[PDB]
Design an enzyme around this catalytic site. Structure first.
Site, PDB file in Angstrom:
ATOM      1  N   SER A   1      28.981  24.275  50.317  1.00 15.87           N
ATOM      2  CA  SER A   1      30.238  23.612  50.073  1.00 15.87           C
ATOM      3  C   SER A   1      29.996  22.177  49.594  1.00 15.87           C
ATOM      4  CB  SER A   1      31.092  23.646  51.354  1.00 15.87           C
ATOM      5  OG  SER A   1      32.227  22.870  51.259  1.00 15.87           O
TER       6      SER A   1
ATOM      7  N   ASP B   1      31.705  43.185  58.333  1.00 17.04           N
ATOM      8  CA  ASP B   1      30.986  41.979  58.752  1.00 17.04           C
ATOM      9  C   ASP B   1      30.039  41.546  57.638  1.00 17.04           C
ATOM     10  OD1 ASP B   1      29.723  39.993  60.041  1.00 17.04           O
ATOM     11  OD2 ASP B   1      28.626  41.282  61.445  1.00 17.04           O
TER      12      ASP B   1
END
Length: 330
Positions: free
Chosen positions: A199, A35
């Site tokens: 992004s 994770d």
């Protein structure tokens, strides 16, 4: 040193991935959920409340000649999905794919929430976010990666998740055979303890690319792609009959649909998520309403590039003094 381990989807939907991990001496092999959005290595154990264990493999520290109680240390964690676990702490030898760390904090669960109990395939979590998020008190502990780092050939790990197929976690090296083209690296903020990046924009299907900054985290422990409501609405508007369902808890679409791809930007590069990756199947067994793999982040407080996004790429988690993320097509 290096390590290399295969990661396997737990079910037909790629809801999560499990990776075998050796703990203790002699080895006890547990299948952990790696994770990158958390920083605790915790396991089902001989200490876990018996009614909260249903088919998991447990770690038994009393059977490990290298286990030592980390006296006074406790831990307690709550995840973004509402799940939780807590317990006490041992140190022990932990190996992943041939890479060994001695003295790793192994957080032994005394209690786990229902979602953990109900998932017999996941024996615990191995956190790979920054060690500033580790929950051990009163002495915070380091992640497996942070403890391995100085021994690694390069201070990196890579995630290469499969679509309906096994993939690989590598530590200490970048497998130049595992991706196509070049890797595009992008800056990371560690301020919230995550692999947080920005992004450069998105496209829906064959549509034009929208240049827009989207801050979010690279999180292997989250199944879906969670993005701003504007982005998500623009995606599902291209699918006839898709709608947001407050009863179901997100966007659903007709199972008869063919889904468009979704592209996200990494600097000047582009990662394309095929439409099929966005199909999470019937909302309930036999339903003709299917659950979408792109959902709004508006109720979370952070955008999450979970497995739907990451499985479309070869992802480099660069833990050098200045961390960075890299993405390549594959």
């Amino acid at each position: 040193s290096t390590g290399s381990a295969t990661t396997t989807p737990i079910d037909s939907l790629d809801d999560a991935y499990i990776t075998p991990v050796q703990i203790g001496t002699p080895a006890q092999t547990l299948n952990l959920d790696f994770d990158t959005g958390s920083s605790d290595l915790w396991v089902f154990s001989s200490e876990t409340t018996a009614s909260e264990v249903d088919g998991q493999t447990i770690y038994t520290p009393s059977k490990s000649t290298t286990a030592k109680l980390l006296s006074g240390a406790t831990w307690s964690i709550s995840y973004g999905d509402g799940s939780s676990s807590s317990g006490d702490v041992y140190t022990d030898t932990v190996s992943v794919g041939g890479l060994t760390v001695t003295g790793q904090a192994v957080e032994s669960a005394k209690k786990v929430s229902s979602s953990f109990t109900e998932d017999s395939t996941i024996d615990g979590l191995l956190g790979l976010a920054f060690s500033t998020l580790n929950t051990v008190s009163p002495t915070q502990q380091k992640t497996f990666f942070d403890n391995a780092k100085a021994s690694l050939d390069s201070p990196v790990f890579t995630a290469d998740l499969g679509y309906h197929a096994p993939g690989t976690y590598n530590f200490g090296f970048i497998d130049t055979t595992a991706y196509t083209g070049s890797i595009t690296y992008t800056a990371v903020s560690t301020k919230q303890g995550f692999w947080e990046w920005t992004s450069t924009g998105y496209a829906v299907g064959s549509g034009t690319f929208k240049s827009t900054s989207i801050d979010g985290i690279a999180d292997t422990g989250t199944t879906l792609l969670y993005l701003p409501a504007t982005v998500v609405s623009a995606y599902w508007a291209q699918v006839s009959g898709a709608k947001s369902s407050s009863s179901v808890g997100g966007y659903v679409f007709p199972c008869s649909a063919t889904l468009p791809s979704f592209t996200f930007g990494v600097g000047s590069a582009r990662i394309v998520i095929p439409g099929d990756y966005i199909d999470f199947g019937p909302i309930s067994t036999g339903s003709s309403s299917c659950f979408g793999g792109i959902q709004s982040s508006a109720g979370i407080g952070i955008n999450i590039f979970g497995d739907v996004a990451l499985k479309a790429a070869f992802v480099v988690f660069n833990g050098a003094t200045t961390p960075t993320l890299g993405f390549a097509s594959k």
